[PDB]
Amino acid sequence: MRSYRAQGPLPGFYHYYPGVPAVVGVRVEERVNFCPAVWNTGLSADPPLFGVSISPKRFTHGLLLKARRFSASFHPFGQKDLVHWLGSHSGREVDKGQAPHFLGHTGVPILEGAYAAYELELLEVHTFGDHDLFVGRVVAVWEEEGLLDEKGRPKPGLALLYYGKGLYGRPAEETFAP
């Protein structure tokens, strides 16, 4: 097994990929923006906390600090083109708010087509290197019954997976229970 000493950013920082990209939706007044975030993770079950790591370079970063509320939606692999598009253009140059979406109970924008989504209230923000971790508390849950299994998980092979550098995939349909 090959090894090397970290000397700055890694040639590739994808050893832990793939991951499901969380589409972060945010609304400030009349403006809506969406931004995929593969750097996302559950952070607490009780209470339910979910986090997304966003670079201050993203237009979304400022909107999150202002709104202090946002959505995190999870989409079928069939929407790979849309998710990729949202992650390849900035709200500084294009109104991504025109992408088909609806407003949640708390007013956060939720990208349409998701099999599940969370409406979150910003709890804390922490800076770690070149990205800021936005910790949100889940205040509302959306589920597309026909696309989820008995435990609220996307059905077999439905989840969109991101491998990094514009490459996507999906899970195999077979699952195993050791």
| Interactions with ligand FMN, residue window 15-74 (CB under 6 A) | 21, 33, 35-39, 53-55, 58-60
Chain positions 130 to 149 lying near ligand FMN, rule: CB under 6 A, are 131
Radius of gyration of the chain (CA): 16
Of 27-35, 59-67, 71-79, 91-99, which segment contacts its own copies by CB under 8 A?
71-79
Q: How far is the CB of 75 from ligand FMN (least distance, A)?
A: 11
Cis peptide before 171 (omega within 30 of 0): no
Q: What does the alpha-carbon distance between residue 80 and residue 101 come to, in Å, rounded to a whole number?
A: 16
Which structure tokens are listed for 144? 């597309």
Instruction: Check binding of 125 to ligand FMN (CB under 6 A).
Output: no
Burial class (CB in 10 A: 0-12, 13-18, 19+), 71: buried
Pattern 122-151, its own copies, x by CB under 8 A: -xx-x-xxxx-x-x-xxxxxxxxx--x--x
Q: Which of these segments, 81-89, 113-121, 136-144, 169-177, binds ligand FMN (CB under 6 A)?
A: 81-89
Q: Does 26 bind ligand NAP (CB under 6 A)?
A: no
- 100 is an interface residue for its own copies by CB under 8 A: no
Interaction of residue 44 with its own copies, rule CB under 8 A: yes
Residues 94-123 that bind ligand NAP (CB under 6 A): 105-106
Do 71 and 120 meet the contact criterion of CB atoms below 8 Å apart?
yes
Alpha helices for 15-145 (secondary structure H)? 59-67, 80-86
Q: Does 89 bind ligand FMN (CB under 6 A)?
A: yes
CA atoms within 13 A on the CB side of 145: 0
